[PDB]
Amino acid sequence: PRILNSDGSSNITRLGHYHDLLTVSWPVFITLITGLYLVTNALFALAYLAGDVIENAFFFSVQTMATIGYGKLIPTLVTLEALCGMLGLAVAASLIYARFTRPTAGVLFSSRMVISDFEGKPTLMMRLANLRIEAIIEADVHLVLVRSEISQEGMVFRRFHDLTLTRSRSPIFSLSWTVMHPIDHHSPIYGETDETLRNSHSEFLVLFTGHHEAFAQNVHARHAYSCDEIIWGGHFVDVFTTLPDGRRALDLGKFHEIAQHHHH
Amino acid sequence: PRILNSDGSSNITRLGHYHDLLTVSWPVFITLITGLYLVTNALFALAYLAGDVIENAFFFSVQTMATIGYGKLIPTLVTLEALCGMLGLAVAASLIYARFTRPTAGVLFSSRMVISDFEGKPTLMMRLANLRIEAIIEADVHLVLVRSEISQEGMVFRRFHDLTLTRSRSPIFSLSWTVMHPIDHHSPIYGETDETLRNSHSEFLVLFTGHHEAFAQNVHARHAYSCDEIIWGGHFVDVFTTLPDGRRALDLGKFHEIAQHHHH
Amino acid sequence: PRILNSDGSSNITRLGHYHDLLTVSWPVFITLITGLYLVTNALFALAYLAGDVIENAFFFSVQTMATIGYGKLIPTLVTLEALCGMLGLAVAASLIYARFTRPTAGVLFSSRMVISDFEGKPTLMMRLANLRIEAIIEADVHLVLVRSEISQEGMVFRRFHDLTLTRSRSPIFSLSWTVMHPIDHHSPIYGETDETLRNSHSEFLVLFTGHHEAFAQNVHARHAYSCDEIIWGGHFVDVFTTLPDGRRALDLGKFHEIAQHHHH
Amino acid sequence: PRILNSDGSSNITRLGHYHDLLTVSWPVFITLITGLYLVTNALFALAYLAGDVIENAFFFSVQTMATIGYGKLIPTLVTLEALCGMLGLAVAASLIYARFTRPTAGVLFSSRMVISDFEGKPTLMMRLANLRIEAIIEADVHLVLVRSEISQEGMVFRRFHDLTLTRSRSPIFSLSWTVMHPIDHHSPIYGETDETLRNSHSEFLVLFTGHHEAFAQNVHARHAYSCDEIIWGGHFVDVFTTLPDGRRALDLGKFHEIAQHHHH
Numbered sequence A, B, C, D: 001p002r003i004l005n006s007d008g009s010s011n012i013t014r015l016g017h018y019h020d021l022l023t024v025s026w027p028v029f030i031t032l033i034t035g036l037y038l039v040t041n042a043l044f045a046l047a048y049l050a051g052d053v054i055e056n057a058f059f060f061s062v063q064t065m066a067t068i069g070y071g072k073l074i075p076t077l078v079t080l081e082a083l084c085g086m087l088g089l090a091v092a093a094s095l096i097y098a099r100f101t102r103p104t105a106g107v108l109f110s111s112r113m114v115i116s117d118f119e120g121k122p123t124l125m126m127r128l129a130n131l132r133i134e135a136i137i138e139a140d141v142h143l144v145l146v147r148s149e150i151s152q153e154g155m156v157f158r159r160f161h162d163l164t165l166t167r168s169r170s171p172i173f174s175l176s177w178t179v180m181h182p183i184d185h186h187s188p189i190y191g192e193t194d195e196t197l198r199n200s201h202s203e204f205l206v207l208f209t210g211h212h213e214a215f216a217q218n219v220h221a222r223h224a225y226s227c228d229e230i231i232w233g234g235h236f237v238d239v240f241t242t243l244p245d246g247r248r249a250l251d252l253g254k255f256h257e258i259a260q261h262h263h264h
């Protein structure tokens, strides 16, 4: 089967949580505090009852934790709860900001890779697209081959080759980017064929990072391919157009399109 | 026409929003929450009326959302609204900080580029100026040529050459910086002339990034030039002066000035 | 004795504190403010008494600092204290966030290093493990030798060699990573033996940094080894397994295991 | 005179402010808001008077801006002021955090540089010291020569040479670091002497950056030297000691000490 899924996640099981709050969906986060919020008040409401030091307990609890202080219920450790309410809000605000600043890239990866000549040399290719109007600055991309290898002797392990790209870094990335690994004699897949790639159970990982100007935050994206997601002889279709207006356009509708010469 | 505008933006149309709040002007941001703020209270004010569980509805709403708690209007889900008011403030504070920390560079770019000899070799040049008193640390600059190219065969595409600079990085950038691409035989515009640059519809993109010490934040700036914004034979005028005091000064009034030898 | 401890700390004494608040345990932090919090109110409570400008002093103090404003105690510099309460919360919230964002890596280091052949060359090795489910992006690792050296003449000093690794950087680090320094003729420990390493009192420092996608934060980890924590001839045991399901697993239970050929 | 001061600041005058709040001393910052804080309330207090829509104006103003809500003064745009108070606090909290996170390095620079042989080659040297107990990670240092130069023809300009160091980067920096520029034939000051350095009015800039583990923040430091602050033949004294305990110590008391052979 597959070590990597398309989204670049691994299926390796591991035998051996602020992050969970950070990761969980927006709806669930509110719920999770809302709960913590009610509960903490139940704590104090029962802490008062245990007595009657308050004129005229759950609702009084929140009135003093939120610092509403209506007044109809004058106290007496309210002071304690006022501390807790303020740290609660401070803690709350931190998580909010961390969640807001979690990296997030709208980078589209091509559904396939191709191997075809480029500048007269066979080249492994794939392409990326920036899905947002704002540019990504100082972008960098890696293409990694992961593949089963063994010594002349029986030992079996998975190799990790970081492949050489004609352009791994780019100061700016705004539209589309075809990433290219020329398969010369230094290439790990030099001389390789469709059949020999399957045998090595070999796979490809794409990793992307850059900085948005779109937000004061960094971004990451990754994607993975199996060897049967490579189109030999294929070529990515141009996604750039000239409109009737005479103006240049990017058509992402053609982004996954690949041309192939069909033999008889 | 032009793919790039002076400010380094593209005119490519794309066929295929926390950022909007982050981007929008300061005046509009306040308005946008102020609205959200009033509205959310209208929600609760109508949520109470639907009944009369409050002694002595919009104004009571805010009194419990802001946690003012005057008291003349004692309750009963106020508790719910107290949660919302606190997250509202937390959300509010996040956006504020993100906006405050959005990258912003006061970098001035020269209105033109020049090509003239430098150390006995023709050199593409342009210059940058730091507009603030605080230095930018670990600055880096790129000069990119974008240009139409085609195969011997008919296919037409735009090239992107990241040009070699005598100095792409600088640990500090405080005043003025003339960026230089020597046009040797490795240069994409080697042997090139005024006429041949127009034909390729070729353009130049400048990209700048660095870290301020001025704020704990990074900065970006970019600018673009057409081939008719290059002055062949031109030289940037020295912007450094010695004052009457005998003290050294930077005169940004001369920043866009270029000297030219005029032929008969 | 040892300059470095396993955890990569030094024992060098130095003859010559927001950070303390930032560093201190979670329990102690709350205590430290709680104190500051009570005390600041004692200040104002005594500032009122010094007179009786309040209808119907410590408890009134907090009611106006937390902005509870019950009302049974109407005032008059309350205004002053309302400023202080708000900055207190602002200061509080900053420390909280800084603490939350302090770098933290769950990177496991192997208890030993080994020197054994790899691709037919003797190689210094050690391994790292990512202890969390989330990957570390753009990871980098250094292996440094620290060692006593002297001139032909008597002067004695400690050298710091940053060793060459077959792979110092990795775009992603998710599971396990064996770091390798081939001991060729350019190596500081080329020709070196067990005995000659002890004489130089030589030590090894591992330094790790990378960015989590797990949180919008960076991470650091380091570890140190003495020369008697190197196993000559040793080999790290494969920590990867195939489960009954036929699925691939990582067994960290084998992470510190090293195989050795035992001579007669 | 001098272009650079010891602290690495320039004396170049420039002919052509959130940062000010960010920069200003701690005492002045509080004052600056305290003012803004009082004033904004004067605005509303006069906005009420202009009438009498409040039962039983400056003090009522703060009671509704701080959300104290005592109650003895029930309202009516209080709602407006409750918005302002909350953004005020949000703005306040942002500045606080930005100030807290402003880069700050406790890096000590040696009062002088030296030129003396090292590994049998004349070497420009200076040293740095980490003044805090926490290490700086991924540190980098530059040595720049700035110097007047002119063409064979009369034109006069200041050069900026980024000098080659035996070690410009270090994964960790914890104690002391002697930075070294070997003066080989590629060096801008190769063949140079004391007298020829003065004539070029030449100067040296040190720039330091790294990341603390001490706080989740980066650091910068810089320093400058004139040519008469170079000691020819000088050697930095070892700052490392062995204590009576037999334990290794760092004595910063010797940090600026330089040994010199005195000729007859």
Ligand SMILES: C[N+](C)(C)CCOP(=O)(O)O
Residues within 6 Å of the ligand: A167, A170, A172, A173, A174, A175, A176, A177, A178, B160
């Ligand atoms: C393709 N590229 C990123 C390498 C260069 C051009 O940038 P872009 O304008 O196509 O986004």
Ligand SMILES: C[N+](C)(C)CCOP(=O)(O)O
Residues within 6 Å of the ligand: B167, B170, B172, B173, B174, B175, B176, B177, B178, D160
């Ligand atoms: C021009 N430079 C940035 C490359 C070097 C000098 O820095 P600056 O002092 O002119 O700002």
Ligand SMILES: C[N+](C)(C)CCOP(=O)(O)O
Residues within 6 Å of the ligand: A160, C167, C170, C172, C173, C174, C175, C176, C177, C178
């Ligand atoms: C070992 N490595 C980090 C260099 C490459 C592979 O990454 P990983 O998937 O094993 O964590």
Ligand SMILES: C[N+](C)(C)CCOP(=O)(O)O
Residues within 6 Å of the ligand: C160, D167, D170, D172, D173, D174, D175, D176, D177, D178
């Ligand atoms: C000197 N150095 C930073 C290059 C290497 C050693 O680090 P340190 O332990 O002396 O601080």
Ligand SMILES: [Cl-]
Residues within 6 Å of the ligand: A007, A008, A009
């Ligand atoms: Cl993932």
Ligand SMILES: [Cl-]
Residues within 6 Å of the ligand: B007, B008, B009
């Ligand atoms: Cl732009």
Ligand SMILES: [Cl-]
Residues within 6 Å of the ligand: C007, C008, C009
């Ligand atoms: Cl440590």
Ligand SMILES: [Cl-]
Residues within 6 Å of the ligand: D007, D008, D009
């Ligand atoms: Cl300075």
Ligand SMILES: [K+]
Residues within 6 Å of the ligand: A066, A067, A068, B066, B067, B068, C066, C067, C068, D066, D067, D068
């Ligand atoms: K309140």
Ligand SMILES: [K+]
Residues within 6 Å of the ligand: A067, B067, C067, D067
């Ligand atoms: K509040």
Ligand SMILES: [K+]
Residues within 6 Å of the ligand: A067, A068, A069, A070, B067, B068, B069, B070, C067, C068, C069, C070, D067, D068, D069, D070
């Ligand atoms: K209140």
Ligand SMILES: [K+]
Residues within 6 Å of the ligand: A067, A068, A069, A070, A071, B067, B068, B069, B070, B071, C067, C068, C069, C070, C071, D067, D068, D069, D070, D071
């Ligand atoms: K109140």
Ligand SMILES: [K+]
Residues within 6 Å of the ligand: A069, A070, A071, B069, B070, B071, C069, C070, C071, D069, D070, D071
């Ligand atoms: K009240």
Ligand SMILES: [K+]
Residues within 6 Å of the ligand: A090, A093, B090, B093, C090, C093, D090, D093
């Ligand atoms: K806050």
Ligand SMILES: [K+]
Residues within 6 Å of the ligand: A093, A097, B093, B097, C093, C097, D093, D097
């Ligand atoms: K914050």
Ligand SMILES: [K+]
Residues within 6 Å of the ligand: A097, B097, C097, D097
């Ligand atoms: K923050």
